[PDB]
């Protein structure tokens, strides 16, 4: 999708 | 009676000029870590991990992997949130995050509008000069499965500018 994290990047 | 423009930042980076203005009214710790470690050379060196056209570019990681970077003060800290501070333009700068309260040093700027962003992530800037750069950075070949851009772009230096109005 479209989220901003750090470390698990997800969908 | 003076008046206090605030605090702004200059990001030199290897293909232009972006000028962030920080909201330290609003976002006071998201603020000063920002600037504190601006100020200690953090940033010097970081690329853009992540490059999404049409979404957000990201950075701030020291180890370029996507998972590092920590606040000056070393330990994450808590969010910042305010109603008046959205996604809603081409520019605006936040912080990245692994959910409630864990920000650290990562942080991007967005493409465009983002409004499922709102609420999740403190924003604490809005890129007010060099729009230009932001061009650049977005039609960059990137990988396709990561987005970490074909050829590495950094952030060489930081000029952390003062009260406009002294």
Not at chain 2, 18 to 40: G, H, Y
Not at chain 2, 156 to 163: E, L, M, Q, V, Y
């Amino acid at each position: 999708x479209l989220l901003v994290t750090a470390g698990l990047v997800l969908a | 009676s003076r008046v206090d423009g605030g605090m702004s930042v200059t990001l030199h980076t290897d293909v232009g000029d972006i000028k962030i203005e920080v909201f330290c009214e609003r976002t006071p710790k998201t603020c000063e870590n920002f600037l504190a470690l601006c100020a200690s050379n953090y940033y010097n060196g970081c690329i853009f991990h992540r490059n999404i056209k049409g979404f957000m570019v990201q950075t701030g990681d020291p180890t370029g992997t996507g998972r590092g970077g920590n606040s000056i003060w070393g330990k994450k800290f808590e969010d910042e949130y305010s109603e008046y501070l959205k996604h809603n333009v081409r520019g605006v700068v936040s912080m990245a995050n692994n959910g409630p309260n864990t920000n650290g040093s990562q942080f991007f700027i967005t493409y465009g509008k983002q409004p499922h962003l709102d609420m999740k992530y403190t924003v604490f800037g809005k890129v007010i000069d060099g729009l230009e750069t932001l061009d650049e950075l977005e039609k960059l070949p990137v990988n396709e499965k990561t987005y970490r851009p074909l050829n590495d772009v950094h952030i060489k230096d930081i000029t952390i500018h003062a009260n406009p109005f002294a």
